[PDB]
Amino acid sequence: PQKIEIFKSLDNWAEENILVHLKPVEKCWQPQDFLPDPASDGFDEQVRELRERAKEIPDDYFVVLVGDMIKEEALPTYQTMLNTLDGVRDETGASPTSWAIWTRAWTAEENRHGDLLNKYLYLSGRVDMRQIEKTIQYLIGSGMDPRTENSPYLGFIYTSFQERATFIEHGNTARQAKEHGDIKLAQICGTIAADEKRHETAYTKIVEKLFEIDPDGTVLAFADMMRKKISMPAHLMYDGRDDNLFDHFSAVAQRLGVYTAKDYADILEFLVGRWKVDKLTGLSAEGQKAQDYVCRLPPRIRRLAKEAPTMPFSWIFDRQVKL
Amino acid sequence: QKIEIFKSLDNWAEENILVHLKPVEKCWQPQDFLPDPASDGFDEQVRELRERAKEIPDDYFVVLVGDMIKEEALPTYQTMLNTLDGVRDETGASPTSWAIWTRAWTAEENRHGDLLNKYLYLSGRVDMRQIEKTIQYLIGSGMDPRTENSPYLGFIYTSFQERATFIEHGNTARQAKEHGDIKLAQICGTIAADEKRHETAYTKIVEKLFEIDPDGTVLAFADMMRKKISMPAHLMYDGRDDNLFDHFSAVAQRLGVYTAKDYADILEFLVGRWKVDKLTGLSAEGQKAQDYVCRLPPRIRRLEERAQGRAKEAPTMPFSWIFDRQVKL
Ligand SMILES: [Fe+2]
Ligand SMILES: [Fe+2]
Ligand SMILES: [Fe+2]
Ligand SMILES: [Fe+2]
């Protein structure tokens, strides 16, 4: 109960330092901004142009984009996760605490990412939305356990890591969409990436305050979380066909450079820096041991070739792409 | 106490509740009811959809949109379920029956919003920007059903809510035939069919609760009706209309998609389905609760017959969901 009551005092602090990173709803983009306008005369031409540009984008890029989209559409899970955490749990479903307001507003923001990408993929005609839709249903039913243990310390370190990861992913899919000739798609991934950046900023800011107030508790938390490993939110991906769907998806994302094990370590190196775990002093014997583990981890991961096989993906009608 | 009751019923739930989920491989997917973007007939299928959509009036669309928005607010309803004391998913992937249900239920409901969303998108008859914005408000806004962490209140509530969506989606299916669109009718009907399974499961839980603890469960049922069943989309807002929910509910009332009659008919059904009617050996409080509940449905029907008698013009009203075009209230 002492790590829990910490969060009720920070309620007002959160209003001023965290909630400021949400975009007010009137100022928020909506999927429709980046999609063929079904109320205009140019609808049919906009859709024809989209599908025409989509033919020039290779299947492997689509496999990765799809995977990222699925990850997004599993949103209910991530709101639930947030409400497992002890100081921030929405008690009623419309609680007026800062932490609850964030949780709901963050959710409302992330909801547009899936919506936009879903329609884009639908219109493209380059993927099987039936199998994608089924994958999503498995994923939501499946849930996800990040092993944050109801601890806001673990939880917000986790979300911090996750937000930066999606920032990198969406960022790279934006880059490669330009490279394949589709700037409208590049815009979609870029705008989404920009949202994730605001979320990263807010979540890293919470952990910064936690490192200020309770540095011992927060390095130990940070050590615990890396010891367990950061479990990815879509690790339980399943399409009813491939038992190793996540690994096969991750492998295409690795090859294309959308998300690599390098990017994993780079994120951890960033978070060590951003929280100045590096220069933390006056810790318990445990706290110091945790500090070491954390700081030495990124080079140790980075330390740890060729023609890969082709693999069919039900998301693209079992057509094959390299791994 | 009321919490430990649910950890015993874990195994019972596996056999009597989880059986009402459709296995994922046997589930329809929005793509089944939509133009296939991978076929050559895509452009024709879309042209046909939009052509049929022109013959559907604006007022039906206002109601369909409102129901679609209600659906797309799904994250909220999963959260609600996880506020309840005996059923809360502790980890986010808890293997308890109640948690498996919560997630699977959510996964099922998700296809309802997806499907309707793309339909409305393709129709070209609505402003998806304002709809999208309304949804963002709605999710940020949350919803408090005043179930108080009680699974007794909670599942009574969901039971009521599931039957309501069954009726709504059901009626929008009927009226889509009447306006010439069977493919839309099919969409609403397939969704309605899912809600029916959910209703059945939720009513089944409360039935067991009325068996084990009849005193606790009538009191819960009275509590919930005394408060009134607060609708999940009551906080609807598009950044323009401060009375958006009432104005939406009014069009749905006029069109007969959901009326105060249907409210009472639901309550009369649930009184019957749970046999609150023939419950015996209750506390003095339990008996008072039993009375209130059973006398309520005719009351409501009386008060509505009177309300219809003194109706205050009902103007036309603009809706941002249809580019501020106007429809009667
Ligand atoms: Fe996202
Ligand atoms: Fe994000
Ligand atoms: Fe539904
Ligand atoms: Fe339902």
XYZ file of C-alpha atoms and ligand atoms in Angstrom:
656
model
C 0.000 0.000 0.000
C 2.863 2.499 0.084
C 3.608 2.262 -3.719
C -0.161 2.534 -4.246
C -0.779 5.713 -2.171
C 2.127 7.394 -3.988
C -0.145 7.543 -7.080
C -3.060 9.296 -5.394
C -0.765 12.198 -4.368
C 0.655 12.399 -7.901
C -2.904 12.780 -9.286
C -2.558 16.554 -9.561
C 1.034 16.317 -10.828
C -0.239 14.007 -13.588
C -2.842 16.496 -14.678
C -0.061 19.058 -15.353
C 2.819 16.888 -16.623
C 1.184 13.820 -18.194
C -2.316 14.731 -19.456
C -0.735 17.648 -21.378
C 0.656 15.070 -23.855
C -2.804 14.011 -25.054
C -4.064 15.970 -28.128
C -7.432 17.473 -27.474
C -10.071 15.651 -29.480
C -11.000 18.656 -31.680
C -7.325 18.954 -32.685
C -6.954 15.191 -33.396
C -6.745 13.746 -36.903
C -9.292 11.055 -37.808
C -8.862 8.052 -40.076
C -11.112 9.721 -42.632
C -8.520 12.443 -43.175
C -6.171 9.946 -44.799
C -8.699 7.821 -46.675
C -10.716 8.093 -49.860
C -13.708 10.324 -49.040
C -16.846 8.295 -49.658
C -19.003 11.446 -49.795
C -17.033 13.032 -52.688
C -17.276 12.456 -56.435
C -13.567 11.475 -56.507
C -14.193 8.472 -54.197
C -13.961 5.896 -57.001
C -10.861 7.491 -58.454
C -9.150 7.819 -55.038
C -9.860 4.120 -54.379
C -8.653 3.111 -57.871
C -5.436 5.127 -57.305
C -4.914 3.514 -53.836
C -5.285 -0.032 -55.224
C -3.058 0.799 -58.173
C -0.245 2.057 -55.832
C -0.763 -0.965 -53.563
C 0.150 -3.379 -56.434
C 3.679 -1.895 -56.464
C 4.177 -2.594 -52.715
C 5.649 -6.081 -52.169
C 4.005 -8.838 -50.116
C 6.719 -8.859 -47.449
C 6.025 -5.238 -46.536
C 2.314 -6.086 -46.294
C 2.961 -8.994 -43.953
C 4.723 -6.596 -41.600
C 2.141 -3.812 -41.974
C -0.610 -6.335 -41.324
C 1.114 -7.625 -38.223
C 1.472 -4.088 -36.874
C -2.165 -3.361 -37.691
C -3.274 -6.515 -35.845
C -1.216 -5.454 -32.870
C -3.074 -2.146 -32.944
C -6.576 -3.722 -33.302
C -5.980 -5.723 -30.139
C -6.509 -2.468 -28.213
C -9.064 -3.637 -25.678
C -6.314 -5.765 -24.183
C -3.992 -2.813 -23.561
C -6.658 -0.745 -21.775
C -7.363 -3.713 -19.581
C -3.649 -4.034 -18.830
C -3.540 -0.424 -17.717
C -6.484 -1.037 -15.418
C -4.743 -3.976 -13.730
C -2.187 -1.530 -12.258
C -2.703 -0.697 -8.624
C -2.566 3.111 -8.436
C -4.183 3.853 -11.802
C -7.092 1.381 -12.054
C -10.383 2.872 -13.199
C -12.691 1.822 -10.318
C -16.046 2.681 -11.971
C -15.370 2.867 -15.723
C -15.673 6.674 -15.753
C -13.490 7.587 -12.748
C -12.348 11.242 -12.797
C -8.846 10.620 -11.600
C -6.008 11.841 -13.826
C -4.768 8.280 -14.292
C -8.214 7.075 -15.380
C -8.765 10.065 -17.698
C -5.399 9.232 -19.344
C -6.178 5.581 -19.663
C -9.472 6.296 -21.470
C -8.069 9.094 -23.633
C -4.951 7.104 -24.534
C -7.242 4.259 -25.587
C -9.377 6.667 -27.617
C -6.255 7.870 -29.431
C -4.867 4.363 -30.173
C -8.278 3.334 -31.489
C -7.819 5.519 -34.608
C -4.579 3.707 -35.518
C -6.268 0.371 -35.994
C -9.283 1.919 -37.709
C -7.162 3.774 -40.250
C -4.849 0.871 -41.019
C -7.723 -1.595 -41.180
C -9.524 0.316 -43.932
C -6.324 0.959 -45.760
C -5.583 -2.748 -45.869
C -9.228 -3.509 -46.756
C -9.199 -1.153 -49.728
C -5.774 -2.304 -50.904
C -7.158 -5.651 -51.989
C -3.686 -7.086 -51.453
C -4.535 -9.070 -48.251
C -7.076 -11.529 -46.885
C -9.041 -9.501 -44.394
C -10.891 -12.689 -43.327
C -7.760 -14.285 -41.978
C -6.570 -10.961 -40.537
C -9.918 -10.503 -38.808
C -9.705 -14.062 -37.445
C -6.171 -13.554 -36.196
C -7.440 -10.487 -34.305
C -10.272 -12.414 -32.700
C -7.780 -15.023 -31.470
C -5.465 -12.277 -30.256
C -8.158 -10.505 -28.208
C -9.565 -13.752 -26.768
C -6.000 -14.816 -26.071
C -5.213 -11.720 -23.985
C -1.649 -10.854 -23.103
C 0.337 -11.103 -19.845
C 3.177 -8.574 -19.601
C 3.932 -9.724 -16.025
C 3.606 -6.223 -14.658
C 2.109 -7.811 -11.508
C -0.327 -4.945 -10.811
C 2.680 -2.707 -10.192
C 2.538 0.771 -11.804
C 6.296 0.833 -11.647
C 6.613 -2.261 -13.808
C 3.599 -1.220 -15.871
C 4.782 2.187 -16.972
C 8.315 0.991 -17.675
C 6.639 -1.611 -19.911
C 4.390 0.861 -21.715
C 7.354 3.197 -22.141
C 9.237 0.416 -23.895
C 6.203 -0.570 -25.957
C 5.390 2.947 -27.113
C 8.899 3.536 -28.360
C 8.764 0.190 -30.185
C 5.606 1.090 -32.069
C 7.115 4.528 -32.751
C 10.057 2.758 -34.476
C 7.826 0.258 -36.290
C 5.318 2.743 -37.698
C 8.231 5.091 -38.411
C 10.000 2.484 -40.538
C 6.838 1.359 -42.411
C 6.396 5.045 -43.285
C 9.952 5.239 -44.704
C 9.507 2.087 -46.786
C 6.126 3.151 -48.149
C 7.860 6.196 -49.716
C 10.481 3.802 -51.066
C 7.695 1.756 -52.746
C 6.004 4.916 -54.211
C 3.062 5.459 -51.800
C 3.327 8.781 -49.963
C -0.322 8.581 -48.796
C 0.514 5.305 -47.024
C 3.709 6.888 -45.783
C 1.600 9.699 -44.340
C -0.684 7.203 -42.556
C 2.245 5.424 -40.845
C 3.970 8.750 -40.079
C 0.917 10.368 -38.435
C 0.376 7.233 -36.351
C 4.095 7.229 -35.419
C 3.817 10.837 -34.246
C 1.018 9.891 -31.811
C 3.172 7.095 -30.368
C 5.961 9.606 -29.742
C 3.628 11.701 -27.528
C 2.692 8.523 -25.645
C 6.337 7.543 -25.198
C 7.098 11.003 -23.855
C 4.301 10.812 -21.279
C 5.081 7.297 -20.101
C 8.833 8.014 -19.769
C 7.877 11.183 -17.826
C 5.911 9.164 -15.248
C 8.827 6.815 -14.664
C 11.177 9.802 -14.321
C 9.086 11.044 -11.338
C 9.091 7.554 -9.930
C 12.878 7.459 -10.180
C 12.903 10.827 -8.334
C 10.620 9.859 -5.446
C 11.569 6.211 -5.054
C 14.787 5.439 -6.885
C 15.423 2.151 -5.081
C 11.951 0.814 -5.900
C 12.179 1.941 -9.510
C 15.596 0.456 -10.467
C 14.510 -2.833 -8.868
C 11.343 -2.676 -10.892
C 13.377 -1.888 -14.014
C 15.684 -4.820 -13.285
C 12.802 -7.183 -12.591
C 11.166 -6.186 -15.925
C 14.356 -6.855 -17.997
C 15.130 -10.064 -16.071
C 11.731 -11.401 -17.105
C 12.317 -9.891 -20.575
C 9.899 -7.484 -22.226
C 7.207 -9.817 -23.519
C 5.756 -8.416 -26.786
C 1.957 -7.648 -26.781
C 1.281 -9.790 -29.877
C 3.419 -12.837 -28.914
C 0.278 -15.026 -28.827
C -0.663 -14.225 -32.465
C -2.491 -17.164 -34.113
C -4.468 -17.515 -37.393
C -5.679 -21.058 -36.785
C -3.007 -22.429 -39.084
C 0.563 -21.350 -38.081
C 1.656 -22.153 -34.495
C 4.708 -19.913 -34.960
C 2.960 -16.984 -36.488
C 4.573 -14.394 -34.253
C 8.117 -15.615 -34.939
C 7.482 -15.823 -38.677
C 5.984 -12.333 -38.677
C 8.848 -10.994 -36.491
C 11.339 -12.572 -38.916
C 9.976 -10.657 -41.938
C 10.022 -7.461 -39.836
C 13.618 -8.304 -38.867
C 14.715 -8.824 -42.483
C 13.000 -5.683 -43.738
C 14.456 -3.670 -40.858
C 11.091 -2.498 -39.499
C 11.908 -3.975 -36.087
C 15.166 -5.811 -35.317
C 16.817 -7.162 -32.138
C 19.163 -4.181 -32.555
C 16.163 -1.843 -32.170
C 15.361 -3.808 -28.937
C 18.733 -2.979 -27.386
C 18.706 0.586 -28.786
C 15.400 1.123 -26.924
C 16.823 -0.156 -23.695
C 19.914 2.046 -24.126
C 17.647 5.009 -24.710
C 15.587 4.318 -21.570
C 18.704 3.890 -19.407
C 19.865 7.271 -20.674
C 16.456 8.966 -20.513
C 15.952 7.957 -16.908
C 19.590 8.572 -15.921
C 19.757 5.125 -14.262
C 23.385 5.521 -15.313
C 24.005 8.290 -12.677
C 21.777 7.097 -9.824
C 23.426 7.188 -6.408
C 22.647 6.242 -2.810
C 20.821 2.980 -3.468
C 20.486 -0.204 -1.345
C 22.896 -3.095 -2.008
C 20.061 -4.602 -4.074
C 19.459 -1.266 -5.828
C 23.097 -1.070 -6.884
C 23.061 -4.683 -8.176
C 19.929 -3.809 -10.175
C 21.596 -0.639 -11.517
C 24.534 -2.716 -12.865
C 22.417 -5.415 -14.525
C 20.343 -2.788 -16.313
C 23.281 -0.723 -17.639
C 25.326 -3.679 -18.833
C 22.380 -5.369 -20.569
C 22.319 -3.352 -23.857
C 25.859 -4.150 -25.033
C 25.408 -7.806 -23.913
C 22.225 -8.174 -26.154
C 23.944 -6.470 -29.102
C 26.848 -8.950 -28.914
C 24.430 -11.934 -28.853
C 23.341 -14.322 -42.192
C 22.102 -15.564 -45.671
C 19.309 -17.007 -47.906
C 16.302 -17.616 -45.607
C 13.388 -19.952 -46.528
C 10.056 -18.711 -48.015
C 6.949 -19.145 -45.793
C 3.243 -18.852 -46.608
C 1.107 -16.324 -44.719
C -2.646 -16.740 -44.484
C -2.909 -12.904 -44.213
C -1.867 -12.822 -47.875
C -3.814 -15.938 -49.078
C -0.904 -18.245 -48.254
C 1.352 -16.506 -50.790
C 5.003 -16.841 -49.714
C 7.651 -14.374 -48.500
C 11.236 -14.722 -47.263
C 12.022 -15.027 -43.532
C -18.806 -13.982 0.507
C -20.539 -12.843 -2.763
C -16.976 -12.841 -4.173
C -16.018 -16.411 -3.166
C -19.285 -17.675 -4.679
C -17.739 -16.957 -8.134
C -14.514 -18.881 -7.627
C -16.612 -22.027 -6.954
C -18.765 -21.411 -9.990
C -15.583 -21.284 -12.153
C -16.077 -24.902 -13.268
C -19.831 -24.494 -13.618
C -19.175 -21.538 -15.930
C -16.927 -23.592 -18.181
C -19.830 -25.989 -18.816
C -22.901 -23.659 -18.809
C -21.586 -20.244 -19.858
C -18.507 -20.706 -22.099
C -20.546 -23.083 -24.297
C -22.408 -19.994 -25.633
C -19.311 -18.566 -27.312
C -18.831 -19.567 -30.961
C -15.416 -21.091 -31.562
C -13.297 -18.736 -33.594
C -12.973 -21.052 -36.637
C -16.823 -21.233 -36.761
C -17.255 -17.437 -36.409
C -18.260 -15.158 -39.251
C -15.955 -12.224 -40.031
C -16.843 -8.799 -41.282
C -15.285 -9.660 -44.666
C -18.013 -12.262 -45.223
C -20.634 -9.465 -45.514
C -18.613 -6.891 -47.390
C -17.437 -6.276 -50.910
C -14.378 -8.517 -51.459
C -11.420 -6.260 -52.291
C -9.484 -9.205 -53.717
C -12.122 -10.113 -56.339
C -12.754 -8.487 -59.716
C -16.350 -7.760 -58.688
C -15.157 -5.417 -55.933
C -15.974 -2.245 -57.868
C -19.435 -3.545 -58.835
C -20.208 -4.774 -55.318
C -19.289 -1.330 -53.955
C -21.245 0.485 -56.660
C -24.265 -1.678 -55.799
C -23.900 -1.017 -52.065
C -23.782 2.745 -52.540
C -26.669 2.632 -55.002
C -28.865 0.775 -52.449
C -27.730 3.118 -49.690
C -29.200 6.144 -51.526
C -32.703 4.603 -51.065
C -32.242 4.326 -47.261
C -33.433 7.498 -45.531
C -31.258 9.732 -43.329
C -33.248 9.010 -40.167
C -32.444 5.233 -40.362
C -28.775 6.127 -40.839
C -28.747 8.344 -37.765
C -29.958 5.339 -35.732
C -27.606 2.843 -37.415
C -24.698 5.171 -36.842
C -25.587 5.621 -33.179
C -25.756 1.838 -32.710
C -22.387 1.491 -34.555
C -20.810 4.101 -32.274
C -22.173 2.244 -29.271
C -20.430 -0.869 -30.633
C -17.077 0.822 -31.414
C -16.853 1.960 -27.765
C -15.998 -1.687 -26.895
C -12.867 -1.108 -24.797
C -15.117 0.485 -22.188
C -17.368 -2.616 -21.836
C -14.460 -4.956 -21.305
C -13.182 -2.632 -18.632
C -16.629 -2.645 -16.981
C -16.580 -6.423 -16.857
C -13.160 -6.324 -15.218
C -14.383 -4.029 -12.443
C -16.582 -6.808 -11.140
C -15.307 -8.544 -8.056
C -15.486 -12.279 -8.835
C -14.649 -12.071 -12.531
C -11.826 -9.522 -12.819
C -8.943 -10.574 -15.100
C -6.007 -10.249 -12.679
C -3.145 -10.478 -15.215
C -4.638 -9.679 -18.632
C -4.455 -13.331 -19.766
C -5.924 -15.087 -16.702
C -7.100 -18.618 -17.465
C -10.207 -18.467 -15.231
C -13.523 -19.202 -16.943
C -14.753 -15.686 -16.239
C -11.638 -14.119 -17.770
C -11.709 -16.412 -20.823
C -15.333 -15.308 -21.300
C -14.558 -11.630 -20.855
C -11.858 -11.719 -23.517
C -13.751 -13.942 -25.916
C -16.897 -11.925 -25.553
C -14.896 -8.788 -26.332
C -13.306 -10.508 -29.302
C -16.776 -11.378 -30.598
C -18.187 -7.861 -30.088
C -15.262 -6.387 -31.901
C -16.472 -7.734 -35.268
C -19.780 -5.877 -34.867
C -18.146 -2.449 -34.871
C -15.659 -3.417 -37.607
C -18.385 -4.604 -39.921
C -20.739 -1.688 -39.390
C -17.927 0.807 -39.610
C -16.878 -0.330 -43.104
C -20.454 -0.547 -44.220
C -21.082 3.030 -43.188
C -17.741 4.070 -44.708
C -18.565 2.548 -48.108
C -22.166 3.861 -48.044
C -20.984 7.439 -48.598
C -24.162 8.594 -46.843
C -22.470 9.703 -43.554
C -19.559 11.815 -42.266
C -17.124 9.291 -40.942
C -14.951 12.067 -39.598
C -17.621 13.226 -37.140
C -18.571 9.637 -36.342
C -14.948 8.833 -35.662
C -14.691 11.907 -33.427
C -17.823 11.013 -31.529
C -16.263 7.626 -30.824
C -13.089 9.160 -29.521
C -15.123 11.272 -27.101
C -17.172 8.300 -26.085
C -14.147 6.104 -25.260
C -12.336 8.940 -23.429
C -15.602 9.737 -21.642
C -16.040 6.178 -20.306
C -19.300 5.007 -18.802
C -20.486 4.290 -15.217
C -23.306 1.687 -15.000
C -23.215 1.823 -11.172
C -22.709 -1.886 -10.861
C -20.505 -1.130 -7.819
C -18.017 -4.010 -8.467
C -20.867 -6.418 -7.828
C -21.202 -9.346 -10.271
C -24.826 -9.581 -9.207
C -25.571 -6.049 -10.407
C -23.116 -6.423 -13.277
C -24.601 -9.481 -14.933
C -28.151 -8.267 -14.479
C -26.983 -5.127 -16.281
C -25.265 -6.948 -19.118
C -28.312 -9.213 -19.442
C -30.446 -6.162 -19.944
C -27.947 -4.532 -22.296
C -27.484 -7.636 -24.465
C -31.205 -8.026 -24.994
C -31.428 -4.321 -25.873
C -28.802 -4.582 -28.612
C -30.508 -7.765 -29.819
C -33.722 -5.741 -30.285
C -31.912 -2.735 -31.823
C -29.842 -4.681 -34.325
C -32.872 -6.868 -34.933
C -35.075 -3.905 -35.871
C -32.409 -2.223 -38.028
C -32.249 -5.570 -39.924
C -36.062 -5.566 -40.474
C -36.106 -1.957 -41.693
C -33.145 -2.507 -44.042
C -35.255 -5.120 -45.901
C -38.183 -2.582 -45.969
C -35.757 -0.061 -47.612
C -34.526 -2.618 -50.206
C -31.102 -3.635 -48.784
C -30.968 -7.314 -47.855
C -27.142 -7.272 -47.579
C -27.455 -4.619 -44.861
C -30.299 -6.569 -43.348
C -28.024 -9.580 -43.239
C -25.308 -7.551 -41.457
C -27.646 -6.381 -38.755
C -29.189 -9.846 -38.434
C -25.904 -11.713 -38.036
C -24.854 -9.222 -35.382
C -28.216 -9.582 -33.690
C -27.738 -13.354 -33.580
C -24.434 -12.939 -31.666
C -26.165 -10.695 -29.085
C -28.770 -13.405 -28.532
C -26.062 -15.889 -27.513
C -24.659 -13.275 -25.142
C -28.068 -12.603 -23.665
C -28.580 -16.335 -23.121
C -25.255 -16.696 -21.317
C -25.687 -13.627 -19.127
C -29.257 -14.576 -18.157
C -27.961 -18.058 -17.349
C -25.461 -16.700 -14.835
C -28.138 -14.697 -13.049
C -30.395 -17.756 -13.000
C -27.774 -19.651 -10.989
C -27.414 -16.635 -8.751
C -31.166 -16.644 -8.127
C -30.829 -20.360 -7.264
C -27.964 -20.057 -4.795
C -28.775 -16.669 -3.255
C -32.307 -15.597 -4.076
C -32.474 -12.906 -1.399
C -29.204 -11.253 -2.587
C -30.225 -11.429 -6.213
C -33.715 -9.863 -5.983
C -32.234 -7.081 -3.888
C -29.550 -6.603 -6.543
C -32.249 -6.606 -9.220
C -34.254 -4.030 -7.292
C -31.123 -1.887 -6.661
C -30.356 -1.874 -10.382
C -33.890 -0.839 -11.430
C -34.195 1.757 -8.696
C -31.044 3.434 -10.068
C -32.451 2.883 -13.569
C -30.502 1.105 -16.253
C -28.091 3.864 -17.444
C -27.441 3.350 -21.173
C -23.785 2.742 -22.227
C -23.747 5.599 -24.732
C -25.478 8.240 -22.554
C -22.320 10.425 -22.702
C -22.315 10.595 -26.542
C -20.819 13.900 -27.812
C -19.641 15.112 -31.281
C -18.195 18.397 -30.155
C -21.323 20.219 -31.310
C -24.565 18.890 -29.796
C -24.753 18.822 -26.014
C -27.878 16.602 -26.133
C -26.646 14.163 -28.731
C -27.748 11.039 -26.904
C -31.326 12.269 -26.360
C -31.572 13.441 -29.961
C -30.241 10.093 -31.224
C -32.513 8.083 -28.822
C -35.482 10.215 -30.092
C -34.983 9.209 -33.736
C -34.641 5.588 -32.611
C -37.845 6.012 -30.632
C -39.734 7.445 -33.598
C -38.463 4.796 -36.050
C -39.313 2.062 -33.525
C -35.750 0.662 -33.352
C -35.737 1.155 -29.603
C -38.659 2.603 -27.673
C -39.527 2.924 -24.007
C -41.976 0.063 -24.712
C -39.044 -2.171 -25.605
C -37.478 -1.076 -22.247
C -40.443 -2.381 -20.292
C -40.778 -5.509 -22.541
C -37.157 -6.337 -21.643
C -37.817 -5.973 -17.970
C -40.969 -8.100 -18.258
C -38.942 -10.726 -20.064
C -36.224 -10.782 -17.415
C -38.766 -11.021 -14.590
C -40.241 -14.030 -16.411
C -36.936 -15.613 -17.440
C -35.617 -15.513 -13.876
C -38.956 -16.483 -12.308
C -38.724 -13.548 -9.853
C -42.484 -13.830 -10.162
C -42.567 -17.201 -8.260
C -39.772 -16.662 -5.748
C -40.621 -17.675 -2.199
C -39.101 -17.627 1.293
C -37.401 -14.255 1.083
C -36.568 -11.699 3.778
C -38.963 -8.835 4.430
C -36.584 -6.750 2.261
C -36.453 -9.511 -0.370
C -40.228 -9.526 -0.626
C -40.374 -5.709 -0.925
C -37.778 -5.963 -3.720
C -39.770 -8.730 -5.417
C -42.888 -6.477 -5.504
C -41.141 -3.390 -6.846
C -39.539 -5.347 -9.649
C -42.781 -7.116 -10.752
C -45.013 -3.981 -10.582
C -42.454 -1.871 -12.490
C -43.160 -2.967 -16.119
C -46.818 -1.956 -16.273
C -45.889 1.321 -14.482
C -43.382 2.281 -17.099
C -45.876 1.445 -19.858
C -48.494 3.750 -18.245
C -46.040 6.666 -17.923
C -45.063 6.310 -21.598
C -48.674 6.252 -22.824
C -49.091 9.517 -21.005
C -45.823 10.963 -22.417
C -46.878 10.206 -26.039
C -50.170 12.066 -25.366
C -48.442 15.398 -24.555
C -45.575 15.477 -27.173
C -43.869 18.830 -27.788
C -43.872 19.259 -31.606
C -40.658 17.280 -32.342
C -38.654 19.547 -34.566
C -36.206 18.634 -37.254
C -32.661 18.528 -35.902
C -29.295 18.541 -37.690
C -26.868 15.666 -37.083
C -23.142 16.096 -37.675
C -22.978 12.330 -38.446
C -24.892 13.171 -41.660
C -23.210 16.530 -42.468
C -25.714 18.448 -40.396
C -28.629 17.357 -42.662
C -31.872 17.342 -40.659
C -34.240 14.612 -39.478
C -37.352 14.538 -37.285
C -37.209 13.814 -33.528
Fe -0.669 2.466 -31.517
Fe 0.939 4.429 -28.517
Fe -22.579 -5.800 -29.591
Fe -23.626 -8.291 -27.139
